[PDB]
Design an enzyme around this catalytic site. Structure first.
Site, PDB file in Angstrom:
ATOM      1  N   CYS A 381       0.839  -1.193   0.000  1.00 53.95           N
ATOM      2  CA  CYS A 381       0.000   0.000   0.000  1.00 53.95           C
ATOM      3  C   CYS A 381       0.876   1.245   0.000  1.00 53.95           C
ATOM      4  CB  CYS A 381      -0.946   0.007   1.206  1.00 53.95           C
ATOM      5  SG  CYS A 381      -0.145   0.190   2.823  1.00 53.95           S
ATOM      6  N   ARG A 386      -1.678  -1.253   5.414  1.00 51.68           N
ATOM      7  CA  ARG A 386      -2.840  -1.868   4.783  1.00 51.68           C
ATOM      8  C   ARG A 386      -2.466  -3.136   4.030  1.00 51.68           C
ATOM      9  NH1 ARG A 386      -4.876   2.984   1.284  1.00 51.68           N
ATOM     10  NH2 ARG A 386      -2.605   3.319   1.257  1.00 51.68           N
TER      11      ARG A 386
HETATM   12  S1  LIG Z   1      -0.425   1.540   4.290  1.00 56.26           S
HETATM   13  C1  LIG Z   1      -0.476   3.134   5.296  1.00 56.26           C
HETATM   14  N1  LIG Z   1      -1.772   3.352   5.973  1.00 56.26           N
HETATM   15  C2  LIG Z   1      -1.476   3.733   7.315  1.00 56.26           C
HETATM   16  C3  LIG Z   1      -0.140   3.615   7.548  1.00 56.26           C
HETATM   17  C4  LIG Z   1       0.694   4.138   8.657  1.00 56.26           C
HETATM   18  C5  LIG Z   1       1.551   5.359   8.338  1.00 56.26           C
HETATM   19  C6  LIG Z   1       0.785   6.766   8.698  1.00 56.26           C
HETATM   20  O1  LIG Z   1       0.414   6.891   9.863  1.00 56.26           O
HETATM   21  O2  LIG Z   1       0.679   7.507   7.716  1.00 56.26           O
HETATM   22  N2  LIG Z   1       2.905   5.295   9.154  1.00 56.26           N
HETATM   23  C7  LIG Z   1       2.718   4.823  10.593  1.00 56.26           C
HETATM   24  C8  LIG Z   1       3.564   6.673   9.203  1.00 56.26           C
HETATM   25  C9  LIG Z   1       3.867   4.343   8.460  1.00 56.26           C
HETATM   26  N3  LIG Z   1       0.535   3.148   6.362  1.00 56.26           N
END
Ligand SMILES: */[SH]=c1/[nH]cc(C[C@@H](C(=O)O)[N+](C)(C)C)[nH]1
Ligand SMILES: [Br-]
Ligand SMILES: [Cl-]
Ligand SMILES: [Mg+2]
Length: 425
Positions: A381, A386
């Site tokens: 993703c 995800r």
């Molecule tokens: S696949 C994508 N959807 C949520 C997350 C987590 C992301 C965020 O909070 O934007 N991180 C925790 C910073 C990696 N990744």
């Protein structure tokens, strides 16, 4: 008023398209958990899942129609007891579903007789219900468990309030930054993973039950991922299983499932017990994670295919999905498997109570695009959250060659030499 179907009649209708066998038990009993001590867990072969606890959902009629359950279908309800399907039958009859029958003898008749076919999630014991966790931390004897030491882990992303505002008794918290590096948002190096798991008290032989809290993520916040706790929980489950934690569990639905059952919660700040050694090489299962070079090799491979678990606005390049990524677009050659509304929701892979969607519906959607267990698949993703949940669903079904492309769109788009398409296909 009523209508009953016997075991003889129902057996001769399991292949019929116009009949819809509906399982009104919990989704955890649907997957294969023997919640009443039955000798065979699972559902009647061909049954759809519609838990009766969803009757309080004001979107119940929309859930039914999104499951293609039409008023001209012959509804066949069953449960642990025929009284379990009575309120669901009346709920159908008032909404125009006039042909509604109830199957009385699912337990112990159908379950306790091998002549009747049943189905179940192949790796269901990795998706534990709330009652299983309660008996575990209470010391009581439970099925699908035979270990000495366990650790319940409350997952979150730089939001310890999600843990302090209410958690499972005895549970310790785990920031997602303990297992993934903020520079790449990929899994950390083996030495960092070894040190991080030990200072949380996790060995290779420790049973780890993971869960998170849904706190209504909004795309207008600085860190919406701090509210998608259960996504990070499954994200941490992938990393631990990648590292070498042999027994990793996930509480189906997350913190919502614990409070729905009515169990007690704790607001204490439980300290971490430290263990001196992890006890296994890291990573013990490196095939669960692929990087950018192998991902490019899997695109051109007839044996492989990449699966894009992102929302439609990100797929067509309308939004990037995050407030720290500016390039919009999609990796060329991946198969689109829409996650839901945005980057912090999984509507197409979850029920309203945040439990995993009926896995048959996941297989049928994946199959329509050519996403099959015969291929080697790498879900991805934005940064791997995800994609980890989509990979966990395929792992629970027993698919032999599934992985996660950790870099995702974040690592991909950061190289200007990498291509990307935009717009509606
Ligand atoms: S696949 C994508 N959807 C949520 C997350 C987590 C992301 C965020 O909070 O934007 N991180 C925790 C910073 C990696 N990744
Ligand atoms: Br969540
Ligand atoms: Cl993409
Ligand atoms: Mg990543």
């Amino acid at each position: 008023d009523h209508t009953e179907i016997t075991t003889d009649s129902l057996l001769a209708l399991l292949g019929s398209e116009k009949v819809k066998i509906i399982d009104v038990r919990s989704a955890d009993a649907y997957n294969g958990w023997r919640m009443r001590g039955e000798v065979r867990g699972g559902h009647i072969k061909g049954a759809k899942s519609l838990p009766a606890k969803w009757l309080t959902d004001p979107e119940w009629l929309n859930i039914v129609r999104f499951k293609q359950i039409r008023p001209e279908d012959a509804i066949v309800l069953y449960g642990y007891t025929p009284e379990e399907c009575e309120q669901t039958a009346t709920r159908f009859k008032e909404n125009g579903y006039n042909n509604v029958s109830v199957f009385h003898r699912f337990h112990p008749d159908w379950t306790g007789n091998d002549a009747f076919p049943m189905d179940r999630l192949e790796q269901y014991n990795r998706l534990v219900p709330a009652e299983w966790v309660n008996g575990l931390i209470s010391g009581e004897e439970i099925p699908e468990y035979d270990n000495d030491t366990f650790i319940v882990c409350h997952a979150h992303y730089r939001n310890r309030d999600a843990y302090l505002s209410g958690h499972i008794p005895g549970a310790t918290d785990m920031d997602t930054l303990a297992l993934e590096s903020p520079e790449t948002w990929n899994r950390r190096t083996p030495e960092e993973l070894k040190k991080a798991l030990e200072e949380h008290g996790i060995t290779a032989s420790t049973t780890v039950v993971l869960y998170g809290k849904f706190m209504h993520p909004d795309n207008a916040d600085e860190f919406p991922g701090s509210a998608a706790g259960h996504i990070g929980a499954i994200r941490l489950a992938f990393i631990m299983m990648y590292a070498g934690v042999e027994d990793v569990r996930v509480l189906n639905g997350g913190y919502q499932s614990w409070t729905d059952a009515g169990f007690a919660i704790s607001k204490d700040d439980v300290p971490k017990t430290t263990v001196p050694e992890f006890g296994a090489p890291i990573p013990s299962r490196p095939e669960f994670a692929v990087d950018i070079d192998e991902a490019k090799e899997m695109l051109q491979s007839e044996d492989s295919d990449l699966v894009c678990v992102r929302s439609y606005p990100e797929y067509i390049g309308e939004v990037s999905g995050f407030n720290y990524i500016k390039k919009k677009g999609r990796i060329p050659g991946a198969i689109f498997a829409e996650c839901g509304s945005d980057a912090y929701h999984m509507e197409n892979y979850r029920n309203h109570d945040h439990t995993t969607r009926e896995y048959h519906e996941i297989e049928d959607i994946w199959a329509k695009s050519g996403i099959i267990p015969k291929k080697h698949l790498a879900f991805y993703c934005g940064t791997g959250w995800r994609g980890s949940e989509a990979w966990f669903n395929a792992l629970l079904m027993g698919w032999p060659r599934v992985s996660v492309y950790d870099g995702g769109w974040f690592e991909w788009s950061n190289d200007p030499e990498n291509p990307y398409e935009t717009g509606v296909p």
